[PDB]
Amino acid sequence: MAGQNPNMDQFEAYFKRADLDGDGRISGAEAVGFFQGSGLSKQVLAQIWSLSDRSHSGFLDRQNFYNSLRLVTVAQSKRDLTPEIVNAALNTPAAAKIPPPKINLSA
Ligand SMILES: [Ca+2]
Structure with missing residues (x-):
């Protein structure tokens, strides 16, 4: 990368x-x-x-926050942040595949 x-x-x-x-x-x-x-x-x-x-x-x-955003996108993806999902979102290769979540700010 x-x-x-x-x-x-x-x-x-x-x-x-x-x-x-x-x-x-x-x-x-x-x-x-x-x-x-x-x-x-x-x-x-x-x-x-x-x-x-x-x-x-x-x-x-x-770093914590970079993890946090991944978890957000997971819920954004209409998932439940279950123990496995959270681990999935943070502690697997797929975590790097996770996009930045929809954060309504001024966009
Ligand atoms: Ca501060």
Whole structure:
């Protein structure tokens, strides 16, 4: 890969958008407020956070957040973020195949 894979451009941009204060960490409020644009249910939005905030830091690192977006697209793909699905979305080759989710921002 040449680093800048099509999806990753937006994966980053979503991070850049989610990080409201721009300190480089996605705070939960920043995350949740961003994921409001995803069009997913509050349980899912909460869940994606929990699934991405694996360090339990209360902030998503760029990497955590890059995972988070994959999970979003999974729910976007009309799936349920089940243990296997979450693992599927993050911990398999297919995770790289996952596009950036529909985040209603100003587009
Ligand atoms: Ca922040």
